[PDB]
């Protein structure tokens, strides 16, 4: 016996001691007499349409694949629970937080960003850390990253950013000119670029990295009072990264390093956990904040906004079938129960639309019917009907229009959203110049030490060297605005590669 | 109170007397505060993306429709059971017939052919009568209709026939030139055309017509001996048709006459039933038969091949949700359990492919996952996996390749199909010139009386009059070959219409 | 020869004197030797998979259908042009209006609302009248109908309203309880319900009805000044309707009356046209209007807001292939060129989202690539790429991200939208209690005469009689609120029916 | 830098005195600002009326289509096929009508088991599909870089692929799955020997051969038929990558094959292949020692010499990868008059699968996609409608056959060649056909000691991770090929173990 992941089939076989193997059938349940030979007219004759056993199986094989996620395609998944450890009901009325000790089942999927389905785990790229909370008030999806910020602050630039991070439209090759032309033209990315090219750019698996909601969200309590917040989930396994060299070696030796690591950890009882926190900022404090509290390229300094403990995230169950439970799982940031709402973060606002929209495409109109996506701890009752692959009773004969006089589902007033008064013109406000350096300089000078700065620069230069000179200059010009020693160190490294 | 159908919502309401209305939720189960007004900026301001309650419902509304059936789009469904009354185990070893008194759950769908989803029920058109038997050896789909024969004998002509029966490609109107140009050019249609234009052309609802498998099938017993057969299911309600005038009036008064009739009959306890029979022809008889026993335009004379009683079909349950149970139901002629197999009928052979093929398009790759299509009385175990909208557990962590040394499903020797010897050239054999008039003449002459023949002719002439003169002549020439009186009477009526 | 529609095939044949038919090929262009018989082993043997000609054709046949429109499924289409006859550049800078005499190609589709694809044309229901203008500034879709108003004033009730108008989820039959439970519970529908059950409820074809954009839209001129407007296109053939008896008779005789009528009119040179007008309201006037100027259930009195002539709409070309040019045509209200914008009408706002959304489902992600939907008089250049059935060069090797330093497409500042400053909280504002009777009373009293009010009441009572008494009472209560005579007349008729 | 890297720069340059196009929405409406969304106030929520944003975002959300069930990772190119010799005595297909005749072609090279973001330089067979756009329609020769395959019956294909891919629970490559299947189905011995040899990892796509693999049927002008094999030998020469170098490249450049081919064509180094055929008469098909339609068998060159026919030349790169490569579709059933199938069970199964999988991956009207459209033939038939129906949908032409209105007619000269058969319509077992003879000829005569050593090391290196009982079964099969083959692998396994 090797690692648990390797022994998957052996264990499956063993669990079935009373080896009476099931009868092999067609999709419609008809028993198959011989699924090892096709029907022909005579030993060396042609194949007949009459062989439905063949067609039935082949037609399905021909349809096994579904579109991969447009971003975050390569990932790993696990399941467990969320347990409340502290009382934050003064901030939020959400049932998931109602009592200390209350557990809510969770589903999680970790992932890289740019790489497709057959790409390596151990590569520099941010990491996805999505959490699905199956609450009594429906599903709550906290779709986070392993960073508290992001590259851009306006959603209309997201498709372009992702395009620049992927393959050239003609050559289908990664293109550093694309990567850096966009980044140098859009210096808002300076903060996240700095995080990305640091040591945490390549975590040692999924268990040794933090998780963040990134966006600023809104919490509403029972009295209707609201505050803005941030979600943080620190790894109880401690931060641990892979060196550029080891990451390179592993991407070849085991492209599925992250998947294997997580499966084996759980299989052997080493269940990973994260301590769940929140930062709180009142509406009054939001007015005085030195930056836009809804700018996704900014963090809320811990000094001024201390982490407030809330609970724990524990992963103790591996998927039984990867496609059904991981590949098909869908997280929608808009899935929020009463007590948790969205903030005016332009980026968050854009995601409110994007996720359900893309899910209806890659999964299907009724993707919420898929078991792993089904809000099984809440009764779904509404006036929505039909659609492709309607896998339930489609709500039977219940009246399908609202309002009605026949006893069908009623709206619950207490669930109404929190209302705020906004003022200003309805138009496109430019945010390209919303301070792209202040917090980046703080990160460079105060958070990192000498060794870490040297590596950051070496990592940046190592990739930037392949972009054209004019792109290198504009990129260095941006790093120099962050801190003159930051830009010059990179320029020096570039000079020698050139 | 009116008919049961009208009181659908009222009864639903009453059945929930001592209950509180459910909470209206989003698709993800999040309670909704107000689903009667959208979120806007101020009383007369723009709509916000934040209103995910709105877009969650709208998006689903936008995706309610799926493609209708390419043919037989307009229909009605009901459920019940099939009961064995006689012992035919000497002919077939199929479990569905294993013992007298055995009941098997069934699902049925009645329909017209050419009309789309919003067409009228009472129109001259053959009628679909598909029966799905949920047996222990998988689902057995007997996709029959109200006639023992069909218009053509080769499947490669089916798409063309259907096109001719539907709308003109440019105008989108019914086109009698298309209809009769095809029928006149393909005289093998004379038999079913004669049945269609007779009184049997417009049944009084679905309960007053017979059901037939039409094709010749093959039965195999426990010793491996096989015979050919026909499936017949005669109405216990008695044959009742509608007159041309009544059918036209009803098509305007109640386009859903068949749906209502069936629903009300079942809702009032008047469960419709059919007596199930089979005709048997030994391989030896198949050789001496005057025509091609596998020619779909020919019947097996009752005098030479008597009906052998087998059982009863009873419909005692209305669907609860039409879309999920009727619109989404899928019957595949290729769905046959051990003991029942296909025959070399060219038409049936073509149907072995078309149905699951159109179902993978209409419903989706995993259409067999939809409840009503699921072979719930059987255990589905194989090596098929994944695909869009994959429900259930996708067969867990079971070994996905065959053969394997890990205890996964195994083929069952007893399920092996019956072998028949064939020899000859592998090519396209013309069947256009097979007998196209003999059996038709017997029908025109003996099966029908003088009064019925008159109507047949005026029904034909009534529609044919709108086709060009050259098409009329060609069609009349065909009728004249069946019987001089047949052609002359039609020509006489055409003469005055013209 | 008969009418042009009937002679479609004949004319096609004729336009080919030297009738040497083209060679019959597979989808891949391989010539077919015999498409009338399939390949079998021996004259009475089984079908071979080797018969690719069969499968190729059958497989396409099995996939001919696509989902019908969720609403307005039944319709007809035609093509022509829009011609500017008057100068309104003082209100709008849109290129389509830039100069008197300017001609822009248009596409139009007329339709009913509730019935499915095989339903009748001559039924009571509003009528769709969508116009696609292929301008140099892209496509402009004015998705109108034959009434200036609608049943509801908030988009979130649309799915429910439509459900109440269609079939019972269990019985699949039209349900008057659903129809009237909804309408009586939402009296804002009184205005459009009064219009619907009036003579204009069943137009005599599409050529004899008016067109209206219904909603309030916004126009912006070169100076950046804006005004609100209404779009009107009056029938030059004059208003003409069908009596209840004639409409009923025709729904039986010719379910495709509207299609035939339109086709034959254009085919014989009787090209229908409409005079295009607009009503203009200043932002100042919008502040003093007695009702909400953006309420879909209200009209702008002509006395206070006169029609201002703009141009002509002429349909002079029939479709060559219905499926390709009509069934697949897609109109998006959000398709507006510079100079034409949306207003804060909650209903319009909702439609901005719904159409493109439903089109991505019904047609596909790249539905704009379908010839009839392609903005062929404009150059499409952006950063959108890929997606299923990408039928173009996919913009070749052009840089796929914005911004970029490589010459890819740039935004055009002059196209920037008009900006307004709105005030108030961001929440759901209830409009259920806005004025629901005032304009309706005027309609009943002034717009109609004694003779018309009599028919109106009979039509309403004729359908309402089949709803339960409690629903009849609630409905009459609302009608009475509009005018005593209105309610008492319906009740009197209802009394005899009951 | 290499041409590949300068893609955007060259694009910019080709548009010297041009001026950028106006950025528009999908519907052609000019865009004023596509860098900021519409909000109420500088810090307010997003509005639904920002259709510029939705139009773009909704499309981004739909960019992905399912990848090929197999052969997902690949590279494409275009060029022509030129006839150099006359084989019209064997086939009447227009593509071979005269010396010098050039026909446009589309080619896609690929691996097999890996998904879209996987490495090019890994052990795996290679796909070498060729689409010939002929006057008689498209001819798709969907080949591999091997003349044989692992199995001989199509019903085992889904299982084989499954064993080559990821474990259903762990989503990891599983050597138990790989070897349990191969050891249980020894017919795979021949192709497994090819796979684990030096040619298991070619140096790019230009340094490998292509084969149609299956036995096909050629019919000439007087309706006479013979069986054949298609072979296309690399004019650049066979060149492989060592295991160490392949490993390094898989990390250094997962898109090595793509880059190599692109730059080669970009710099004028147009790769070519010499196209040949092998011919076997119907009589020789009777005398052949094995089943001539058995995919695990080759026709010895000594008895069936390579007959030269023409050249395959790749001289044009894709302008848009998604459009010309990701969306390209090859159907083995696409054969013009003069070229037919043979009773090879594997080929017969492919006749169904490809068009079938294409209707799912691309769509019902996938043949309407430019790269797949048979542009050098007039398509005319009775097929209509379907999703994303581009074109005129054949206009108002009569849609039923037969008709009296002048619509398309069948052409009698296009009829298939008929053969006589006799037998029961049943499932005949082929699991026990010869699984070792030709394999032995490969191990003994074709390879030398260095190569046999490398072969055994390659096999043991991977086989070592499977359970012992699987190892023994595998070794048992290799032993049946040659004692020295199994003993050497076992000795290496003893060591790794
Ligand atoms: C406005 C910008 C954004 C847009 C439009 C966007 C869009 C998307 C889309 C379309 C997907 C694929 C969804 C699927 O197919 O299941 C995706 C996945 C993902 N995104 Fe975002 N994204 C944005 C910002 C972000 C940010 C800021 C975060 C982190 C807080 C994030 C985290 C993720 C994660 C974790 C996944 C993978 C979920 C999974 O494992 O299934 N994205 N994103």
Q: What is the DSSP string of D336-386?
A: -TTEE--S-HHHHHHHHHHHHHHHHHT-TTGGGSTTTS-TTS---SS----
- Side-chain-side CA neighbours of residue B389 (13 Å): 23
Neighbours of chain C (3+ CB pairs under 8 A): A, B, D
Helix and strand numbers (H, E) in chain C are 14, 13
Quick one: DSSP state of residue B68? P
**Is the distance from CB of A375 to CB of A104 less than 8 angstroms?**
no
Of C51, B424, C39, nearest in space to D420 by CA: B424
Structure tokens at B47: 């709509």
Q: How far apart are CA B231 and CA B141, in angstroms?
A: 12
Residue of A68, A69, A364 best suited for mutating to test ligand 1, as the one with most atoms within 8 Å of CB: A69
Distance from CA of B400 to the nearest CA of A (A): 10
**Is the distance from CB of A111 to CB of A76 less than 8 angstroms?**
yes
**Is the distance from CB of D285 to CB of D232 less than 8 angstroms?**
no
> Phi/psi at D425 (nearest 5 deg)?
-90, 90
Structure tokens at A167: 């393959």
User: How many CB contacts within 8 angstroms connect chain B with chain D?
Assistant: 145
Q: Which residues of D touch C56 (CB under 8 A)?
A: 333, 355
Structure tokens at C420: 């307004």
> Measuring CA to CA, how many Å separate A268 from each of A264, A272, A316, A317, B413?
6, 11, 10, 11, 41
Question: Does the distance separating the beta carbons of D402 and B186 come in below 8 Å?
Answer: yes
Whose structure tokens read 């290799």? D478
Q: How far apart are CA C269 and CA C271, in angstroms?
A: 5
Alpha helices in B186-273 (DSSP H): 190-196, 244-253, 257-267
Angle between helices B450-464 and B176-185 (to 10 degrees): 120
Q: How far apart are CA D180 and CA D472, in angstroms?
A: 11
> Measuring CA to CA, how many Å separate C88 from each of B76, C98, C144, C219, C227?
55, 8, 21, 10, 12
Ligand 1, atom 17: nearest CA belongs to which residue? A71
Question: Does the distance separating the beta carbons of B397 and D168 come in below 8 Å?
Answer: yes
Q: How far apart are CA C21 and CA C28, in angstroms?
A: 19
Helix and strand numbers (H, E) in chain B are 14, 12
Angle between helices D483-496 and D468-481 (to 10 degrees): 150
**Is the distance from CB of C110 to CB of C128 less than 8 angstroms?**
yes
- H-helix or E-strand spanning residue C79: strand C75-84
Q: How far apart are CA C311 and CA D39, in angstroms?
A: 36
C72 is known as an active-site residue: yes
* CA angle in degrees (0–180, nearest 5) for C464-C470-C476: 55
Q: Which residues of B touch A8 (CB under 8 A)?
A: 397
Choose, from A145, A292, A335, A478, the residue flagged as catalytic.
A145
Q: Ligand 1 mean position to A145 CA, how many Å?
A: 9
Quick one: DSSP state of residue B133? E
**Is the distance from CB of C349 to CB of C295 less than 8 angstroms?**
no
**Is the distance from CB of C384 to CB of D25 less than 8 angstroms?**
no
Q: How many residues are recorded in chain C?
A: 498
Q: How many CB atoms lie within 10 A of CB B345?
A: 24
Q: How far apart are CA A412 and CA B20, in angstroms?
A: 13
Q: How far apart are CA A346 and CA A156, in angstroms?
A: 9
Residues in A 122-141 with any Cβ partner in B closer than 8 A: 137-139
Please list every protein residue whose CB sits less than 6 Å from any atom of ligand 1: A 69-72, 75, 109, 111, 128, 130, 143-145, 150, 155, 158, 214, 329-331, 347, 350-351, 354-355, 358-359, 362; D 61
Q: Which residues of D touch A255 (CB under 8 A)?
A: 118
**Is the distance from CB of D335 to CB of D139 less than 8 angstroms?**
yes
Q: How far apart are CA B297 and CA B293, in angstroms?
A: 10
**Is the distance from CB of A122 to CB of A258 less than 8 angstroms?**
yes
Q: How many CB atoms lie within 10 A of CB D326?
A: 25
Choose, from B139, B145, B146, B478, the residue flagged as catalytic.
B145
Quick one: DSSP state of residue C369? G
CB burial readout C263-279, b (16+ within 10 A) else e: bbbbbeeeebbbbbbbb
Q: Ligand 1 mean position to A111 CA, how many Å?
A: 10
Structure tokens at D414: 């296009």
Contacts for B227 with CB less than 8 Å, ≥ 6 apart: B91, B218, B219, B280, B281, B282, B283
**Is the distance from CB of B53 to CB of B32 less than 8 angstroms?**
yes
The radius of gyration computed from the CA coordinates of chain B, to the nearest angstrom, equals 26
Of D264, D251, D238, nearest in space to D121 by CA: D251
Q: Looking at the partner chain, which of A352, A368, A390 has a beta carbon nearest the beta carbon of B27?
A: A368
Q: How far apart are CA A444 and CA A489, in angstroms?
A: 12
Quick one: DSSP state of residue B155? G
Angle between helices C346-362 and D51-60 (to 10 degrees): 20
- Sequential DSSP letters for D388-429: T--TTTTTT---SSS-SS---B--GGGPPPP-EEEEEEEE--
**Is the distance from CB of A315 to CB of A108 less than 8 angstroms?**
yes
Quick one: DSSP state of residue B31? B
Task: Determine contact: A375 vs chain B, CB below 8 A.
Answer: yes
Secondary structure of residue A228 in the 3-state scheme: strand
Of A313, A221, A218, A208, nearest in space to A257 by CA: A208
- H-helix or E-strand spanning residue A62: none
Secondary structure of residue A161 in the 3-state scheme: helix
Q: Which strands, in side-by-side order, build the sheet including C425-428?
A: A420-421, C425-428, B39-41
Of D391, D378, D380, D371, nearest in space to D104 by CA: D371
Q: Which residues of B touch A384 (CB under 8 A)?
A: 27, 57, 60-61
B292 is known as an active-site residue: no
Q: Looking at the partner chain, which of C157, C248, C353 has a beta carbon nearest the beta carbon of B36?
A: C157
End-to-end Cα distance, chain A: 51
Q: How far apart are CA A471 and CA D1, in angstroms?
A: 15
CB burial readout D127-153, b (16+ within 10 A) else e: bbbbbbbbebbbbbbbbbbbbbbbbbb
> Phi/psi at D62 (nearest 5 deg)?
-120, 15
Helix and strand numbers (H, E) in chain D are 14, 12
Ligand 1, atom 4: nearest CA belongs to which residue? A351
Name the method of structure determination.
Answer: X-ray
Q: How many residues are recorded in chain D?
A: 497
Whose structure tokens read 């017939």? B97
Task: Determine contact: D247 vs chain A, CB below 8 A.
Answer: yes
Of A412, B43, B21, A399, nearest in space to C433 by CA: B43
Show the beta-strand stretches assigned E in B27-101.
39-41, 75-84
Structure tokens at B189: 């249609």
Ligand 1, atom 12: nearest CA belongs to which residue? A69
- Side-chain-side CA neighbours of residue C480 (13 Å): 9
Distance from CA of C24 to the nearest CA of D (A): 5
Of A370, A485, A351, nearest in space to A72 by CA: A351
> Measuring CA to CA, how many Å separate A222 from each of A168, A278, A339, B71, B98?
51, 18, 8, 56, 65
Which domains does chain C carry? 1-65 (4.10.91.20), 66-149+201-374 (2.40.180.10), 150-200+436-498 (1.20.1370.60)
For B466, counting Cβ atoms within 10 Å of its Cβ (0-12 exposed, 13-18 middle, 19+ buried), the class is middle
Of D410, B154, D3, nearest in space to C58 by CA: B154
Q: Looking at the partner chain, which of B10, B43, B322 has a beta carbon nearest the beta carbon of C429?
A: B43
- Strands A273-281 and A425-428 come out as unpaired
Task: Determine contact: B39 vs chain C, CB below 8 A.
Answer: yes
Structure tokens at C4: 């042009």
Quick one: DSSP state of residue C344? S
Secondary structure of residue A98 in the 3-state scheme: coil
Show the beta-strand stretches assigned E in D32-99.
38-40, 74-83
- H-helix or E-strand spanning residue D313: strand D307-316
Alpha helices in C62-185 (DSSP H): 158-165, 176-185
Q: Looking at the partner chain, which of B9, B172, B346 has a beta carbon nearest the beta carbon of C47?
A: B346
Q: How far apart are CA A251 and CA B1, in angstroms?
A: 72
**Is the distance from CB of A78 to CB of A108 less than 8 angstroms?**
yes
Whose structure tokens read 């620069």? A457
- Side-chain-side CA neighbours of residue C136 (13 Å): 8
Beta bridge partners of D104: D80
Nearest chain A Cα to B341, which residue?
A50
Beta bridge partners of D423: B422
Whose structure tokens read 């719904």? C354
Q: How far apart are CA A36 and CA A48, in angstroms?
A: 15
Structure tokens at D127: 């796909």
Ligand 1, atom 30: nearest CA belongs to which residue? A144
Contacts for B25 with CB less than 8 Å, ≥ 6 apart: A138, A378, A379, A380, A381, A382, A409, B31, B32
Structure tokens at C179: 């129809």
Show the beta-strand stretches assigned E in D31-111.
38-40, 74-83, 102-110
Of C351, C389, C393, C453, nearest in space to C141 by CA: C351
**Is the distance from CB of C340 to CB of C296 less than 8 angstroms?**
no
Q: How far apart are CA A424 and CA A421, in angstroms?
A: 10
Of C261, C260, C254, nearest in space to C123 by CA: C254
Q: Which residues of C touch A415 (CB under 8 A)?
A: none
Structure tokens at A179: 């990567």
Distance from CA of B420 to the nearest CA of C (A): 10
Of C332, A169, A224, nearest in space to D324 by CA: A169
For A324, counting Cβ atoms within 10 Å of its Cβ (0-12 exposed, 13-18 middle, 19+ buried), the class is buried
- H-helix or E-strand spanning residue A450: helix A450-464
Secondary structure of residue A151 in the 3-state scheme: coil
Q: Ligand 1 mean position to D7 CA, how many Å?
A: 29
Q: How far apart are CA C180 and CA C176, in angstroms?
A: 6
Task: Determine contact: A397 vs chain B, CB below 8 A.
Answer: yes
Task: Determine contact: B413 vs chain D, CB below 8 A.
Answer: no
Contacts for D191 with CB less than 8 Å, ≥ 6 apart: D125, D146, D148, D149, D150, D296
Would the annotation count D190 as a binding residue?
A: yes
Q: How many CB atoms lie within 10 A of CB B405?
A: 18
Residue of A355, A358, A360, A372 best suited for mutating to test ligand 1, as the one with most atoms within 8 Å of CB: A355
Of A374, A316, A270, A311, nearest in space to A108 by CA: A316
- Side-chain-side CA neighbours of residue B258 (13 Å): 30
Q: How many CB atoms lie within 10 A of CB B430?
A: 12
Q: Looking at the partner chain, which of B47, B159, B185 has a beta carbon nearest the beta carbon of D382?
A: B159
Contacts for C255 with CB less than 8 Å, ≥ 6 apart: B119, C118, C119, C120, C121
Quick one: DSSP state of residue C444? I
- Side-chain-side CA neighbours of residue C277 (13 Å): 19
Q: Ligand 1 mean position to D388 CA, how many Å?
A: 29
Distance from CA of D317 to the nearest CA of B (A): 33
Nearest chain D Cα to A351, which residue?
D57
- Strands B340-341 and D307-316 come out as unpaired
Peptide bond into D402 cis (omega under 30): yes
Q: Which residues of A touch C185 (CB under 8 A)?
A: 403-405
Peptide bond into B403 cis (omega under 30): yes
Q: How far apart are CA D382 and CA A234, in angstroms?
A: 64
Question: Does the distance separating the beta carbons of B346 and C40 come in below 8 Å?
Answer: yes
Would the annotation count A428 as a binding residue?
A: no
Structure tokens at B205: 């609802």
* CA angle in degrees (0–180, nearest 5) for A230-A234-A240: 135
Q: Which residues of B touch C251 (CB under 8 A)?
A: 252
């Amino acid at each position: 016996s090797r690692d648990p992941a390797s022994d998957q089939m052996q264990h499956w076989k063993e669990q079935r001691a009373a080896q009476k193997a099931d009868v092999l059938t067609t999709g419609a349940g008809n028993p198959v007499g011989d699924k090892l030979n096709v029907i022909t007219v005579g030993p060396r004759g042609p194949l007949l349409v009459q062989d439905v056993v063949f067609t039935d199986e082949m037609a399905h094989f021909d349809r096994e694949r579904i579109p991969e996620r447009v971003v975050h395609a390569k990932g790993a998944g696990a399941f467990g629970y969320f347990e409340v450890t502290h009382d934050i009901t003064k901030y939020s009325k959400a049932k998931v937080f109602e009592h200390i000790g209350k557990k809510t089942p969770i589903a999680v999927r970790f992932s890289t960003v740019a790489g497709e389905s057959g790409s390596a785990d151990t590569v520099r790229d941010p990491r996805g850390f999505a959490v699905k909370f199956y609450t009594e008030d429906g599903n709550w999806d906290l779709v986070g990253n392993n960073t508290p910020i992001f590259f851009i602050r306006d959603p209309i630039l997201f498709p372009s950013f992702i395009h620049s991070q992927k393959r050239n439209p003609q050559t289908h090759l990664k293109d550093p000119d694309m990567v850096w032309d966009f980044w140098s033209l859009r210096p808002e990315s300076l903060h996240q670029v700095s995080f990305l090219f640091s040591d945490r750019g390549i975590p040692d698996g999924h268990r040794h990295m933090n998780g963040y909601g990134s966006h600023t969200f809104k919490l509403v309590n029972a009295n209707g009072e609201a505050v803005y917040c941030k979600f943080h989930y620190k790894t109880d396994q401690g931060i641990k990264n892979l060196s550029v060299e080891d990451a390179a070696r592993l991407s070849q030796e085991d492209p599925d390093y992250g998947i294997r690591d997580l499966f084996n950890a759980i299989a052997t009882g080493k269940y990973p956990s994260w301590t769940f926190y929140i930062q709180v900022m009142t509406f009054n404090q939001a007015e005085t904040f030195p930056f836009n509290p809804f700018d996704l390229t900014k963090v809320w300094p811990h000094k001024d906004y201390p982490l407030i403990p809330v609970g724990k995230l524990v992963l103790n169950r591996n998927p039984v079938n990867y496609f059904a439970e991981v590949e098909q799982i869908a997280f929608d940031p808009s899935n929020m129960p009463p007590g948790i709402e969205a903030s005016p973060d332009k980026m968050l606002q854009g995601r409110l639309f994007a996720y359900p929209d893309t899910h209806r495409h890659r999964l299907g109109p009724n993707y919420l019917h898929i078991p792993v996506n089904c809000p099984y701890r809440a009764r779904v009752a509404n006036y929505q009907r039909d659609g492709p692959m309607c896998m339930q009773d489609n709500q039977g004969g219940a009246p399908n229009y609202y309002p009605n006089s026949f006893g069908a589902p009623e709206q619950q007033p207490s669930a109404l959203e929190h209302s705020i008064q906004y003022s200003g013109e309805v138009r496109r406000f430019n945010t390209a110049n919303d301070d792209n350096v202040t917090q980046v300089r703080a990160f460079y000078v105060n958070v990192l030490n000498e060794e870490q700065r040297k590596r950051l620069c070496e990592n940046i230069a190592g990739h930037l060297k392949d972009a054209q000179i004019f792109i290198q200059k504009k990129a260095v010009k941006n790093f120099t605005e962050v801190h003159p020693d930051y830009g010059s160190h990179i320029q020096a490294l570039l000079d020698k590669y050139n």
